[PDB]
RNA sequence: AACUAUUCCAAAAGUUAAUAACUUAACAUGGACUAGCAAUUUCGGUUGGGGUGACC
RNA sequence: CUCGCACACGCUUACAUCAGUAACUAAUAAUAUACUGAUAAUUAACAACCAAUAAACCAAAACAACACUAAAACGUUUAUUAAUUACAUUGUUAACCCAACACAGGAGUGCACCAAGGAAAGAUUAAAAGAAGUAAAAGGAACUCGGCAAACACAAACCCCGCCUGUUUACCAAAAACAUCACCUCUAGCAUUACUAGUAUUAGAGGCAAUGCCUGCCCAGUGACACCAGUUUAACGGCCGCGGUAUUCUGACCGUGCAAAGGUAGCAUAAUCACUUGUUCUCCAAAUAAGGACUUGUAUGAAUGGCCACACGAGGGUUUUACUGUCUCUU
RNA sequence: ACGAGCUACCCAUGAGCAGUUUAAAAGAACCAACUCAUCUAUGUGGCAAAAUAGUGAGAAGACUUGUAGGUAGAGGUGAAAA
RNA sequence: ACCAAAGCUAGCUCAACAUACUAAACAAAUACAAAAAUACACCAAAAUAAAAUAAAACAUUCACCUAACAUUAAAGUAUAGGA
């Protein structure tokens, strides 16, 4: 084979002994009691050395196995960063759902009733756009990483604004940058998810189950897409260390225990550094399917059975442009088997909030052809996120 | 074009080249101090 | 290192010129120390341990000028402290084996004082030297305790 | 080209040479980037209290001197731990073998200020 | 310097290339194996275009045959058969395993070694016969290779065919690829130059008799 | 002459039948061969100024 | 009149206050940022110093929506352990550096054309000669090697040589020299420092120059493969005499000799030995100039490339108008 | 022995190119910053051991340029000017 | 009459004797880019001296030419040398 490594660069053999060692019987004369090096006196061998009192920055790294929490099977941890090829087919396998392409019904009547829109909407939102691509930064073209919060929080800012006409939007709260923890088995491979998220909204109330019983009983009898040369596992982190505790980032008799929306940001210049879509929906659909497992396990128990109450986690993710947008309703623990009922996913797949922006103003044969601000909008984007948010209320 | 100006003033470079370090990396160098210090130098480098 | 003259005339070039042995890989068993050693070896050598009638004989029976390596030097050295200290190690298991070596080379038999310092350079010997007298200074405490106490002795013993 | 007979100094060199003008080091760089300080490097200032202490720098002109005899471990032995040695060897109860009661001390290690190592700075 | 005409190039990244077309991920199962294509992209350090493949849990950019597309199905295997196989243009196969008239691409040299000759673009040898457990294969530079059997070799004819018929505008283009100017001394002819025509040398057998 | 590419012989490792024949993985020594890369040295004198022609 | 402010690099107190200058420094005084003595000074938030070990990562920056080729610098989260505890160290001046000098030279980056920086004249007189500028009757290149320089012009064509952008003799030569796309030869079947982390559509050693028509003959010598025969010129290189003949001039032709073949296509008094200012036409009032023709050039000639061609050139020569102190002839 | 802080060529790491014409960031075109130095006049112990003034060529590339490293004289380097 | 001139000392040179030979100062920092207390290493090495000159040129050769063996003679002898 043709091995990766090069002589040169790799570390240096240490120089063969010399020939007074290979004497049996005989004691070699070593420069080691003058304690400097001298031409002429045989090299000599030193033990390994031992820190009789340990130092916690100095020493030697500990093996993996030295850890309590090791163990022999290799569990498949998803993290933040982690990307899936197959995303949708790869997310759908793992999490054993069934893929809707409209928001539901509800979400459409709540989006499209003409009485939950604010006062002057394509003006605030047309403002909104312009605050965080143009004026919130004093240089000239701000980069995304500053424009994606802020046009994340923007959003959230106009769609609280509407606590006023609608009073129960006070139940909820933000959260930062939590500890999540969801393990499961499904198909003899140990899976779990595991990280963090951008912000997270919280709920006193539990979010009302969405998908009918004809749906899910429809579900039953829907066969999931297999794929054959790329194993369902590729994508995720190989980890010998976890534990098996499915850990949500609130801990007990937390006032706002139900999540009901999650919020993704890719915030990053370059291409190869944030996600392409399908993998955004795949990090979407396992997070929201951890933080609906946290939810149905801490309200069930361990035991592995289907739910009469079904689990409702809904999710945003955003470049900043384009958003992509994901109901989830969790329904089955026991994933072991791949007969029985199946969860739904309600995804609408990359909608346009704008076309492009002009920072400055583009003169063509000294005339200004196109003006400042941008090009282009789509306000059912807006609805749609809208009436995510109000689905509470 | 003009000339006179071929000493362009880098402590960096002028460390590395001539440095003490320098000098006794190399045999050579070495003897350069050895004869500076027969001599009787009062700089035995930079 | 030397030179020649080209087609053996004297009026010719005169050629800087270097003559190198030989050399071979060869495998050299000692049955004083029991060890297989892979030294690079001359034919002359290897005429030498034959004519010698022994490796180990050719080690003990040509001198230092004769064999001007540090390694043969080292080989030498061992091999004799071996012989001078008579040790069990070179077969625990059979002893009337370990007397059949050790009688054939009892002509060479040299006690231990110097029979260790045979291969040794002048920077390991000096090295050794200031080994051995490599002493931690006594404190002044114990030689004024002795002087005191030699004094009470010597005022004990007056009255 | 420069200055050779100059001392090679960090007000000399670009912003990349910073070199210290002999001061000691209190602390290491933390997880931060920051400088985490020790308390323990720190050298605590022993002080005495000099109120109720009755001495004053400057020695009176008719306050004679004295013949100058340096202090030699001959003349400490003999002060200190001789007294001791004779006492016990008049009574019979020198131990050759045990001397740390006469003020001896076999290894340094034990003790908290070493004096072959120096361990205490002043 | 050592070799002469050489700097100045574009930036360039290197991508990990896998040249041993069999290799399993696990030795608990050795047999043949399946792996999808999903990208061709083109590779700035050789003439080829490398297509990423990936199975199991592992991605490897191999270099591409002629029509290897987005989402493919590639088959590796080292059964040789007395039925032969059915090349396609994808698969890897040992040489033992491939009928008379094949053209192969990326062919290995000793068992185990991995795949060291016909790599660039649009370059592709051919199989001659099979004679007592060895096979005798032809290069692209018209000599005949022979070697063991059992090495495997992926059939077909390497992409970009049409590098050989680029066309370069300018000598700007030169200093973007690397290519620094010939010097210019004028050197006179030697008896080196001139069309000489040589009988072909004989075949290059990696295969030790004992 | 050194060095770099050949080739041959010797050295070296070995294999054959009851002395002769044959082979050389990487180094590697000695003596030769073909070439490159090259190493040292020089540009006889008269000339109605040198060069050409001529002469010694 | 406008090279300002600051930073990086570099210099090293030359900076600031007070006092002195007979003399030393300013190429001269006045006094002082450039000499003398004493005393002080630049205070960190800015900058330096400022964690590794495994793993998921193919998908450019160009307002980046999405694309082109030459394939493109710039980091996240997951796990393991990272002393935990106010105040660490270092650079903070300047009118400054490299040029022997307080030198009309050289000097990287960020914002400005002034809101900041400075002074061409030491005082007279207004000779010649010299440098720079402005203006000029009539004429408009008649001056000169050349329309060099200058000008109210800032245009239109023909050649030579190189295709072109580019590069070179730093300090006398920027070109017709070199390189270059394209076209050709040779030499190589291959693995851990070049070539190359490549594999004959590849990589080196070279030649000639894009493109279009083409590249005629020869292995006799000298090289190179073959280690002797034999093969090679897009290898080093070479490609004929003597004599007589058709209605003169010439020679389609023939005789004979030597060679490896006897210079083919093309072009041509040319950047092409000398004759030469070869002969003729146009241009001019006049031309050894220039362009077009004739052409043995007995020493042109085909990748040491031959011919033409668009575009191109601070290259080398020509003509037309326009323009002018170049000049008549200076003021 | 010492020299690649100038220069010749590379390896890193960075930074610049405004306006105008065009489907074009096309080794296109006008012209700044910027880089060279065509021609002329001064200068010739000069401002200067190669400069000043006018005029010129390129100016999105085979372009300049900051910092740092490397190749050393039987040599290095060279779009050959010895 | 200016500019100028004059000293006798600092100190060196050659030997001899002579212990036996890298002086003085080392409180701190010194081979990070020397004079900067403080972290998981790598460390190290040898291969004939050549030529300018003389042989009126220059090829074999050319005393001394950084290898302790001294003086009186043998002796500028035997020998070695484009002899
Ligand atoms: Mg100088
Ligand atoms: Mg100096
Ligand atoms: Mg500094
Ligand atoms: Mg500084
Ligand atoms: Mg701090
Ligand atoms: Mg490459
Ligand atoms: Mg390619
Ligand atoms: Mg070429
Ligand atoms: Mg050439
Ligand atoms: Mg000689
Ligand atoms: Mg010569
Ligand atoms: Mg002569
Ligand atoms: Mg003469
Ligand atoms: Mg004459
Ligand atoms: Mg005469
Ligand atoms: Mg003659
Ligand atoms: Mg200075
Ligand atoms: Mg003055
Ligand atoms: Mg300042
Ligand atoms: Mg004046
Ligand atoms: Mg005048
Ligand atoms: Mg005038
Ligand atoms: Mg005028
Ligand atoms: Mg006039
Ligand atoms: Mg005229
Ligand atoms: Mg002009
Ligand atoms: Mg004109
Ligand atoms: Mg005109
Ligand atoms: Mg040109
Ligand atoms: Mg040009
Ligand atoms: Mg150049
Ligand atoms: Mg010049
Ligand atoms: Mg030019
Ligand atoms: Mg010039
Ligand atoms: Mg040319
Ligand atoms: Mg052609
Ligand atoms: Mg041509
Ligand atoms: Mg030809
Ligand atoms: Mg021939
Ligand atoms: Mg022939
Ligand atoms: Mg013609
Ligand atoms: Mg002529
Ligand atoms: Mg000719
Ligand atoms: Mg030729
Ligand atoms: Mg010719
Ligand atoms: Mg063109
Ligand atoms: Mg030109
Ligand atoms: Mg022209
Ligand atoms: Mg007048
Ligand atoms: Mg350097
Ligand atoms: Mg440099
Ligand atoms: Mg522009
Ligand atoms: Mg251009
Ligand atoms: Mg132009
Ligand atoms: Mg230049
Ligand atoms: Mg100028
Ligand atoms: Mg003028
Ligand atoms: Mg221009
Ligand atoms: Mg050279
Ligand atoms: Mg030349
Ligand atoms: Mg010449
Ligand atoms: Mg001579
Ligand atoms: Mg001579
Ligand atoms: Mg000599
Ligand atoms: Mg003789």
Redesign the pocket.
């Known amino acids: ?9 790799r570390k ?4 063969p002994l010399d020939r007074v060692y290979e004497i049996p019987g005989l004691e070699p004369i070593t420069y080691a009691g003058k304690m400097h ?1 001298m ?1 002429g006196l045989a ?1 000599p061998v ?1 033990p390994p ?1 031992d ?1 009789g009192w340990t ?8 093996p ?1 196995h030295e ?1 309590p ?1 090791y163990k022999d099977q290799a569990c498949y ?1 998803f ?5 899936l ?1 197959e995303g949708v087919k790869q997310a759908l396998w793992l999490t054993k759902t069934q893929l809707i392409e409209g928001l539901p019904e509800k979400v459409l009547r709540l989006a499209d009733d003409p009485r939950n829109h604010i006062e002057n909407q394509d003006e605030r939102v047309l403002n909104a756009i312009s605050h965080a691509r143009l004026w919130h930064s004093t240089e000239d ?1 701000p980069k ?1 990483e500053t424009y994606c919060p802020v046009i994340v929080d923007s959003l959230i800012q106009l769609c609280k604004s509407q606590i006023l006409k609608h009073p129960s939007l006070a139940r909820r709260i933000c959260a930062q940058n939590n ?1 999540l923890s969801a393990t499961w088995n499904r198909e003899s491979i140990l899976l779990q998810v ?3 998220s951008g912000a997270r909204l919280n709920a006193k109330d539990p979010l009302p189950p969405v998908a009918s019983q004809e749906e899910v009983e429809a579900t039953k009898n829907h066969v999931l897409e297999t794929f054959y040369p790329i194993s369902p596992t ?6 010998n ?1 976890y534990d098996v505790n499915d850990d949500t980032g609130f801990q007990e008799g937390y006032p706002y225990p139900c999540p009901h929306t999650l919020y993704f940001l890719e915030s990053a ?5 944030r996600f ?1 879509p399908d ?1 955004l929906r795949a990090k979407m659909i396992l997070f929201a399917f951890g933080s609906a497992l946290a939810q149905a396990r801490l309200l069930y128990g361990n035991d592995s059975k289907v739910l009469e109450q079904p689990v409702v986690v809904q999710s945003v993710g955003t470049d ?3 958003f992509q947008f994901l109901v989830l309703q969790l329904n089955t623990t026991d994933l072991a088997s791949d007969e029985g009922v199946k969860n739904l996913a309600w995804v609408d797949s990359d909608q346009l909030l704008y ?12 005339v200004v052809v196109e003006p400042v601000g941008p ?2 909008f789509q306000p059912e984007t807006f609805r749609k996120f809208l009436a995510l948010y109000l689905h509470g209320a | ?26 045999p ?2 070495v ?2 101090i050895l004869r500076r210090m027969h001599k009787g130098r009062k700089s ?3 | ?3 020649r ?2 087609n053996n005339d ?15 890989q060869r495998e050299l068993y000692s049955e004083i120390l029991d060890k297989r050693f892979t030294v690079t070896v001359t ?1 002359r050598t290897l005429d030498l341990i034959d004519q010698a009638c022994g490796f180990d004989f050719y080690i003990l029976k040509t001198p230092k000028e004769d064999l001007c390596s540090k390694f043969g030097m080292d080989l030498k050295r061992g091999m004799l402290l071996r012989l001078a200290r008579q040790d069990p190690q070179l077969h625990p298991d059979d002893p009337a084996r370990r007397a059949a070596i050790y009688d054939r080379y009892k002509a060479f038999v040299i006690p231990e004082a110097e029979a260790e310092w045979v291969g040794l350079t002048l920077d390991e010997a000096v090295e050794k030297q200031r080994l051995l007298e490599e002493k931690d200074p006594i404190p002044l405490f114990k030689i004024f305790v002795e002087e005191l106490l030699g004094q009470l002795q010597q005022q004990a013993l007056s009255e | ?3 050779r007979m ?37 050298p605590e200032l022993v002080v005495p209290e000099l109120a109720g202490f009755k001495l004053k720098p400057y020695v009176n002109y008719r306050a004679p001197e004295g013949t100058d005899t340096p202090l030699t471990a001959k003349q400490l032995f003999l002060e200190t731990a001789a007294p001791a040695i004779e006492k016990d060897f008049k009574a019979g109860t020198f131990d050759p073998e045990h001397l740390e009661k006469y003020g001896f001390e076999p290894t340094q290690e034990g003790k908290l200020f070493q004096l072959y190592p120096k361990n205490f700075p002043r | ?17 896998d ?1 041993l077309r069999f290799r399993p991920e696990h030795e608990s199962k050795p047999g043949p194996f399946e792996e999808k294509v ?2 061709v ?8 275009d490398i297509a ?1 493949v990936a199975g199991g ?3 490897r950019w191999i ?1 591409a045959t002629e029509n290897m597309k987005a989402g493919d199905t590639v088959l590796n295997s080292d059964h040789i058969g007395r039925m032969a196989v059915a090349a396609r243009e994808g698969d890897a196969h040992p040489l033992g395993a491939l009928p008379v008239g094949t053209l192969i691409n990326n062919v290995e ?1 000793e068992p185990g ?12 040898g051919v199989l001659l016969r099979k004679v007592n457990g060895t096979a005798i294969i032809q ?3 018209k ?1 005949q ?1 022979q070697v063991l059997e059992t090495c495997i070799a992926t059939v077909g ?2 992409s ?6 680029r ?32 009988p072909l ?1 004989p075949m ?1 057998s ?1 295969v030790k008799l004992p």
């Open positions: 084979a043709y091995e990766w490594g090069v002589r040169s660069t240096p053999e240490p120089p090096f031409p090299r030193f050395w820190p130092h916690p920055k100095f020493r030697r790294l500990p993996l850890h929490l941890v993290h933040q960063r982690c990307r090829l073209i995304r500890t595991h990280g963090s590729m994508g995720l982190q190989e980890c260390v210049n370059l291409r190869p550094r392409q993998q900043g442009r384009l076309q492009h922006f002009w920072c400055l103003p583009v003169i063509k044969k000294k090009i282009g | 074009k003009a000339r006179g100006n071929e000493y362009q003033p880098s402590n960096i470079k002028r460390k590395h080249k001539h440095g003490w370090v320098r000098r006794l990396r190399t050579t160098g003897q350069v035995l480098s930079h | 290192l030397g030179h003259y080209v004297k009026l010719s070039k005169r050629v800087r010129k270097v003559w190198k042995p030989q050399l071979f034919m | 080209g420069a200055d100059s001392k090679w100094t960090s007000k000399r060199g670009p912003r990349t040479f910073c070199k210290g003008r002999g001061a000691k080091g209190t602390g290491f760089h933390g997880r931060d980037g920051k400088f985490v300080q020790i308390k323990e490097m720190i | 310097i050592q070799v002469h005409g050489i700097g100045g190039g574009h930036k360039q990244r290197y991508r990990m290339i040249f999903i990208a992209r083109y590779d700035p350090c050789r003439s080829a990423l849990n592992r991605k270099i040299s070694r991995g795949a060291q000759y016909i790599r660039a673009a649009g370059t592709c290069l692209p530079s000599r290779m004819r390497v970009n065919v049409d590098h050989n018929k066309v370069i505008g300018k000598a700007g283009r030169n200093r973007w690829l690397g290519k620094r100017p010939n010097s210019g001394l004028w050197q006179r002819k030697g008896g080196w130059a001139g069309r000489k025509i040589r040398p290059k990696y």
